[PDB]
Amino acid sequence: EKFAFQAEVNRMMKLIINSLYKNKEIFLRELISNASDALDKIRLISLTDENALAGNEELTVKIKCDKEKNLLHVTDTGVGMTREELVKNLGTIAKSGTSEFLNKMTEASTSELIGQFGVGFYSAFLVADKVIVTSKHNNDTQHIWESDSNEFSVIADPRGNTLGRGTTITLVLKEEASDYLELDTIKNLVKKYSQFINFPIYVWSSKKTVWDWELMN
């Protein structure tokens, strides 16, 4: 249940890190944008079958900081991923045109190259020592994908179905990336990266203080 990344994905990872170490916050743009895509897919699926929305009726992105645990969570109620999809889409295969989307990277700002080829997930390793993807798809049981980028593993989630339908990306942050645990930093970055997203985006925030979802767009 442990897997080597494919070679071009290794190169893509290294390329994305060396390109973007200057602009780490880009990871958040990409995760938000990828969450939006997932929501789009399940909304499209719901056109012809709205049993599609049964496990979870809402279409949202919900972002949560755990400063004490050094975690950042990005959760969408999109289409989710099957176990098989986690293995194929997140490492073992590359999309057509990968086998050098990589020239264009080097040659001829890679900020939009990544967003354009839909490969921004890997910018998560800019700010994170570990990335965990917990995902629930209508056609499968909830699974966990985990990676420090030197391999990955996929397991059935022992907790069962807690997402309903969708995906959480959990980042174990690097020391270099500790500012991304701060609420005002994340809020200000989610506001900026979500103004053109059509799904509502929440940050778990504080306001006798109480916590709750704060809408960011």
Residues in binding site: 34, 76, 89, 121
Residue whose entry in the numeric block shows the structure tokens 């190169």:
11
Near ligand 6C0 by CB under 6 A: residue from 13, 31, 105, 163: 31
Residue 206's φ and ψ, nearest 5 degrees, are: -105, 155
Neighbours of 198 (CB within 10 A): 11
Type of residue numbered 206:
S
Give least dist CB 85 to ligand 6C0, A. 7
Give least dist CB 160 to ligand 6C0, A. 18
Is the sign of the CA dihedral 202, 203, 207, 208 positive or negative? positive
Near ligand 6C0 by CB under 6 A: residue from 38, 59, 128, 163: 38
Q: Which of residues 56-85 bind ligand 6C0 (CB under 6 A)?
A: 76, 78-81
Give least dist CB 209 to ligand 6C0, A. 30
Q: Is the peptide bond before 52 cis (omega within 30 degrees of 0)?
A: no
94 counts as binding ligand 6C0 under rule CB under 6 A: yes
User: How far, in whole angstroms, is CA 94 from its chain's centroid?
Assistant: 17
Give the separation between CA 155 and CA 187, rounded to whole angstroms: 32
25 counts as binding ligand 6C0 under rule CB under 6 A: no
Q: List contacts with ligand 6C0 (CB under 6 A).
A: 31, 34-35, 38, 76, 78-81, 89, 93-95, 118-119, 121, 135, 167, 169
